[PDB]
């Protein structure tokens, strides 16, 4: 939340899920942002479960 | 095994696995290489067990 303006407010690029930043576009009344891509598929995401 | 060198020595965009291309243009000594990247997430391997 303080990564939301503190980006919008100084050259701070940040350190998070792309998708998050997908959504934090997508939430911007002014399209002023950029992103840049990420591809390591040798790991991926899982959902826990009872063991 | 069919198209080596016809994508060395010829109009062939040949279209495999990455990897085997890291071990071909590692067999190849003549310089006569050149590949694009790609990011395909859905497809992958990992070893089966027993069910």
Do not use: M
């Not at 100084?10 to 942002?33: H, I, M, P, Q």
């Amino acid at each position: 939340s303080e990564g939301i303006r503190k980006a919008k407010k100084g050259n701070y690029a940040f350190l998070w899920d792309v998708a998050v930043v997908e959504y934090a576009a997508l939430t911007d009344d002014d399209c002023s942002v950029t992103v840049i891509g990420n591809s390591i598929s040798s790991k991926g995401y899982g959902i826990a479960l009872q063991h």
